[PDB]
Amino acid sequence: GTPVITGWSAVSPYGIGRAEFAAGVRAGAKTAVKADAGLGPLPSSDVCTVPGFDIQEQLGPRGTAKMDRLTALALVASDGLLLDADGNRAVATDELTGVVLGITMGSLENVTDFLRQSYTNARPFYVDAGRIPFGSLNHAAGATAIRHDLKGPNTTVAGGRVSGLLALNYARRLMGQGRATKYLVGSAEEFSAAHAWFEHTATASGDPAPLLGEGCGLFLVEQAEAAERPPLAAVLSVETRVDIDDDPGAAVTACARRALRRAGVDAGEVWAAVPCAAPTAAGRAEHEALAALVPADALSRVPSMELLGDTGAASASFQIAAVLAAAEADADSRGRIALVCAVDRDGAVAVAVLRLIG
Amino acid sequence: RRRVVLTGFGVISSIGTGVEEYTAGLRAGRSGARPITRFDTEGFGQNTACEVPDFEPGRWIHHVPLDDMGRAGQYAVAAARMAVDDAGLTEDDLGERQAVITVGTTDGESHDIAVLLEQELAAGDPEAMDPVLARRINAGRLSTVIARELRMPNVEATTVTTACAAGNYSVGYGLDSIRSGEVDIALCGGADAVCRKAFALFKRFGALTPDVVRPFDKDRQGILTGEGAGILVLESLESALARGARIHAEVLGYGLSCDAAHPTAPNRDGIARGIRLALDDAGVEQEEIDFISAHGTGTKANDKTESAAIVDVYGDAPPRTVAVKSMLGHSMGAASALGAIACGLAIEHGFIPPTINHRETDPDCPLDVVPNRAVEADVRIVQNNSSAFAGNNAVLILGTY
């Protein structure tokens, strides 16, 4: 009953789809563009947006005029995962197909636009009523279920940079309890002016205005015995901690050692190790913890993600996607161990250990 | 399969703080309705909500600085301290123990988001925004601050953002986590804080009552926004018995369904599937349910649709069906957690909490809502319903140990 990832998709600053993501990672492509003047004033004019992404162009004219970018990113990723390049159905789903999405704080654009209208219109509930449905933190996961007729478990979890790994562990547990036979698992973050200003406000006094990215990574997860497709990777362990002593290096080390022990593997077996590379002291501490723990060749196995910028809740999903893209490109990845880890500003630390198959 | 029991309840509510006060409020049919103090109500044409009246964070929070949390985080942390004390667990008992900490929320620190936006608006300058607020607005913090307060580093801190069903999802995740064998304890519940965002949202939806919350009433007019936190200590039966814990009740099962239909309307078929899944997971038959703690928000749409789903599953013989939100208003992510604790206390103390403000049952809700006053009953097995925006349904079954 080991969970296996049998498919993946990505909408990222590399573009739309897993092939764009795979190519951009392999190329070390730059993704930073000058922000649309339409976004208004920003802490930084440089952003890592999904290129050529228009919500109505991607999703059509029905229910899309007021849709939040977060929801739109998740829906396009869900199409990439369940459909082929021509919209044919690639993955069979049913009422035992779960959905779990990780977020930071949903669409901050939606909630700030709402409150701004509350403060500035003639009365404090005189808001754009058509935007209200899209504001709910669970809207993206619920919209994915409406789109693909997914009557099974539908969950959204927060946790920011670790949210993709909390989502993965949540899916693993509910599958182990028989609540689902398959799961759509991932995480997503929109680019917004509101998010960029809140990040600039929250960052350590006089840190540089961060380069922010966006997108959604999603995986199809099945039980090994029952998989309707070849496994790309087995999920051997997902371990979590809370950094209660503000020592993220020690918290990462302790979390990774437990994840490897629970997987039944030595640190020396780790073939690829991908940290979240938060542009922070916690991010550098995470990097240095891994640089001591796993083989140096594991840290250089997967091209750096740094040119996607800070992708917030998408982080750990993009990290798993980079691992699967590396594994696919290298026959020698078969049966090897990959480690993904992330540290979130709110204290959570998470490490996943995968056996690559393919 | 492993049995899971409730050893501790922590309650910060509009009708009582602490297990004893909350039990008295439920039995007495106390109303949580009072004037809003949290924000400026001028222009809403109304100013009633179900705020926690007298919150004293200093009384429960020892380690985490208060300005590291908004009001929702402070409620979650205070309720988690009360829960571990009610369970007879010390910080030393908790320290090593691998645990899940899962807090459900709808809005998290949306009050602090509004205050940040006031700072930008007053200034005409986003540089005027307070870093202290910006650092505490993300929902993931509601779960990590409990681990920090309780000195528990070996924790999976997962905030579940499934809006008005979030407490039930959190308790269920704790049940699944302990059943897995991977942990023997989970701190689970929900927390939210009254805010302009929720008040404005419900007002613009026309979902606010102009006076009182009358779930299942023929002339019901909608909800009052509420807040607070309920935190439940879930333990493996083995672990509870080994340390001589007092057991309030057993977690028998839960059910998750998704309507896959509409982003805000309830769905009779989705709610009915959630109930059936919960009864199947709990291993119980319809006939063994002593009462249902309904999602029961007091809107026209909610109560009609939820009644129809209940009548559907229970085949024209539904059990007593009560609405704790008559007393609490709608505490959002906390609602299903405070409902779950009400259900555990109903089982332990042999009473059904009333549906207050009740004048006449809607003829299209052919239910015994236990109107206005609690009754004594042999309560052994209880269903706690929840539903949310984005079609999310979660139903929890608790039993006697």
Domain ranges in chain A are: 1-358
Q: Do domains B6-255 and B256-397 have the same CATH topology?
A: yes
Contact yes or no for A134 and B182 at CB 8 A? no
Contact yes or no for B157 and A347 at CB 8 A? yes
Check if A128 contacts B (Cβ < 8 Å).
Answer: no
Check if A88 contacts B (Cβ < 8 Å).
Answer: no
> What distance in Å separates the CA atoms of residue A11 and residue A17, rounded to the nearest whole number?
6
Extract the tokens encoding A229: 């497709």
CA distance A7 to chain B (A): 22
CA distance A26 to chain B (A): 32
Query: How far are the Cα atoms of B51, B115, B139, B227, B359 from residue B47, in angstroms, in the given order?
Result: 11, 19, 27, 15, 23
Three-state DSSP state, A14: coil
Q: Give the one of B43, B160, B180 whose C-beta lies nearest to A177's C-beta.
A: B180
The DSSP 8-state label assigned to residue A307 in this structure reads: G
Q: Identify from B156, B201, B389 which residue to disrupt to test chain A contact, counting A C-beta atoms within 10 A and taking the largest count.
A: B156
The full DSSP string for A117-129 is HHHHSSSTT-S-G
Check if B144 contacts A (Cβ < 8 Å).
Answer: yes
Q: Are B279 and B255 in contact (CB under 8 A)?
A: yes
Number of H helices, E strands in chain B: 13, 15
Check if B23 contacts A (Cβ < 8 Å).
Answer: no
Q: Are B8 and B241 in contact (CB under 8 A)?
A: no
C-alpha closest to that of A80 among A219, A188, A197: A219
Candidates 3.40.50.1360, 3.40.47.10, 3.20.20.70, 3.10.580.10; correct CATH number of B6-255? Answer: 3.40.47.10
Answer positive or negative: Cα dihedral of A341, A346, A347, A348.
negative
For residues B334, A187, A294, A233, the Cα torsion angle rounded to the nearest 10 degrees is 110
Q: Residue A62, class by beta-carbon neighbours within 10 Å (0-12 exposed, 13-18 middle, 19+ buried)?
A: exposed
Residues in chain A preceding a C-to-N separation beyond 2.5 angstroms (breaks): none
Q: Are A141 and A171 in contact (CB under 8 A)?
A: no
3-state DSSP percent of chain A in helix, strand and coil, to 5: 45, 20, 35
Solving technique for this entry?
A: X-ray
Check if A41 contacts B (Cβ < 8 Å).
Answer: yes
Q: Residue B122, class by beta-carbon neighbours within 10 Å (0-12 exposed, 13-18 middle, 19+ buried)?
A: exposed
Contacts of A152 in chain B (CB under 8 A): 256-258
Extract the tokens encoding B13: 């509510």
Domain covering B256-397, topology: Peroxisomal Thiolase; Chain A, domain 1 (3.40.47)
Q: Which of A247-275 are b and which e, b meaning 16 or more Cβ less than 10 Å from the residue's Cβ?
A: ebbbbbbbbbebbbeebebebebbbbbbb
Q: Give the one of B151, B157, B197 whose C-beta lies nearest to A240's C-beta.
A: B157
- The residue assigned the tokens 């990777």 is A233
Cite the DSSP H helix spans in B205-288. 237-242, 268-282
Ordered by start, the domain boundaries in chain B are 6-255, 256-397
For the beta carbon of residue B201, count every other beta carbon within 10 angstroms: 26
The catalytic residue positions of B are: 164, 295, 330
Q: Give the one of B126, B147, B162 whose C-beta lies nearest to A155's C-beta.
A: B162
Extract the tokens encoding B278: 């919960």
> What distance in Å separates the CA atoms of residue B151 and residue B101, rounded to the nearest whole number?
12
- β-pairing, B155-160 vs A337-343, is unpaired
Q: Which of B54-88 are b and which e, b meaning 16 or more Cβ less than 10 Å from the residue's Cβ?
A: ebebeebbeebeeebbbbbbbbbbbbbbbbbbbbe
Contact yes or no for B121 and A106 at CB 8 A? no
A325-329: long-range contacts (C-beta < 8 A, 24 or more apart)?
Answer: A325/A18, A325/A21, A325/A22, A325/A25, A325/A26, A326/A25, A326/A272, A326/A301, A326/A302, A327/A232, A327/A233, A327/A272, A327/A356, A327/A358, A328/A22, A328/A232, A328/A358, A329/A22, A329/A26
CA distance A123 to chain B (A): 5
Check if A127 contacts B (Cβ < 8 Å).
Answer: yes
> What distance in Å separates the CA atoms of residue A100 and residue A190, rounded to the nearest whole number?
17
Q: Are A260 and A43 in contact (CB under 8 A)?
A: no
The full DSSP string for B298-356 is --HHHHHHHHHHHHHHHTT---EEE-THHHH-B-THHHHHHHHHHHHHHHHHTEE--B-
The full DSSP string for B106-174 is SSTTHHHHHHHHHHHHHHT-GGGS-HHHHTT-STTHHHHHHHHHTT--SEEEEEE--GGGHHHHHHHHH
